[PDB]
Amino acid sequence: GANKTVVVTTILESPYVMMKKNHEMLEGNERYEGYCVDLAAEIAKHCGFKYKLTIVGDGKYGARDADTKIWNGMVGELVYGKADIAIAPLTITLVREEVIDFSKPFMSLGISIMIKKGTPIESAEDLSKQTEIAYGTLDSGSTKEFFRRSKIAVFDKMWTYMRSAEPSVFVRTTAEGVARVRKSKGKYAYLLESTMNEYIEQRKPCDTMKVGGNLDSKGYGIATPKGSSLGNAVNLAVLKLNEQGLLDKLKNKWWYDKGECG
Amino acid sequence: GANKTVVVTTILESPYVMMKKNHEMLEGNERYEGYCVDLAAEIAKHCGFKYKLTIVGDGKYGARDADTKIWNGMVGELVYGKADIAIAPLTITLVREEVIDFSKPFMSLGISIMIKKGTPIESAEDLSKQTEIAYGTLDSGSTKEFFRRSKIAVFDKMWTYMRSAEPSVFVRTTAEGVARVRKSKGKYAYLLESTMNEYIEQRKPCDTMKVGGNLDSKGYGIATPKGSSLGNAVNLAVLKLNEQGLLDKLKNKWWYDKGECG
Ligand SMILES: N[C@@H](CC(=O)O)C(=O)O
Ligand SMILES: N[C@@H](CC(=O)O)C(=O)O
Ligand SMILES: [Cl-]
């Protein structure tokens, strides 16, 4: 029953986990910085464990293949026994809750629209009623699944377009989506979680923005393999850190103190 | 192992649970209406149980006495075996999570400031720096505990004032707090959760408003006695109802379709 170093799976997603510019000079956990790097240190301190940060091998959040039923991404790392905990912007969803355990949420968010500044779109309804401006989502995460499973008219219409659009409107990483918005001269809009959208709006070159309200409301949770004894302590730590204002401090540190757009 | 009617504890708090105007003509669950009445019906349908709504006897959310260590309110009803589930705007907190089980949250909120229109206050900092305008909170809930336990300078200053203020700035129910704001000619401001503040701002006589940002961020959860077998199904139902847009529909029904202030 010896104490064992906890293997943490996480994902390179700004400002949650980022490679320090000089990462090749550094070793181990010191290579990384961000909101989730700081949160991992706090959770570990409050739960009394030592840990090793690892970046998910496939760069994905996690989805299940319809035919093989195999989970990929961080969810897969937990499900198949490769990691002990995921500390990442991992959205709590019904399908995931059935296969992994989640803390109460450490951050709230909703799906939102990113545009290149000046794009004549203000809402999901606006996007759904036109095709000149292409729009899409990240693969292998909760946002794509939201559209695929929606029975709400506007979102069904959006999914109906996205699933058949040529060329593909889907991207492998948030960075790819943002690059496509920036390089498409207003002819691509990107659907992504409000947290990431709000961060990117305050980073140079300051050419994107969030428009409209959020399309839904949900949260990120710290995930553990189903039935793991670590889950109880981690959940209490999230609640304690929230109540002591630490999560709000980290939000301010990594979003608004990081603002470059004045 | 016979199916047993589930006893639901809840609280009279608008627009979550309200007595219908003609309640004396009605019996049982039909006496009540509101967001949590609708949510209870949906949760029960998705979990396959029958239920009886009961209003918490002491009219309280739930706190533990420092000396006797006895829990009151809805929390007490669960802890001492008087109810099987609480379906109410019951805030998920560390101290409660240790004694009862909670679903993932069904609604997000934060502590907020209610003023009578025209009161010269825009922030918690503003309140903390003066005493002409008295301010307080509800007894026996999470908002009072937030201030009592805060180590954040502005909130500690506020608690330092509130705890010794004469006459008392604390109230037994939200309705009492709102009445005091309305009747105090701008000389009382009330600290309460944003959800309730936003509802009341859209009800006649349309003389109150929310000012400033929220002071914190947290959620309401459906609560069960610790270890209850019902908790798993209830949690999945909350997630499913969120994902299918039902919670958003209920929010719109009970807040904005209920708007009387045009
Ligand atoms: N945070 C999301 C990523 C997305 O799909 O927007 C997830 O957990 O899958
Ligand atoms: N909803 C809160 C009430 C409050 O204190 O504002 C609770 O659960 O205690
Ligand atoms: Cl948040």
Ligand SMILES: [Cl-]
């Ligand atoms: Cl919400």
Ligand SMILES: [Li+]
């Ligand atoms: Li939601």
Ligand SMILES: [Li+]
């Ligand atoms: Li928070």
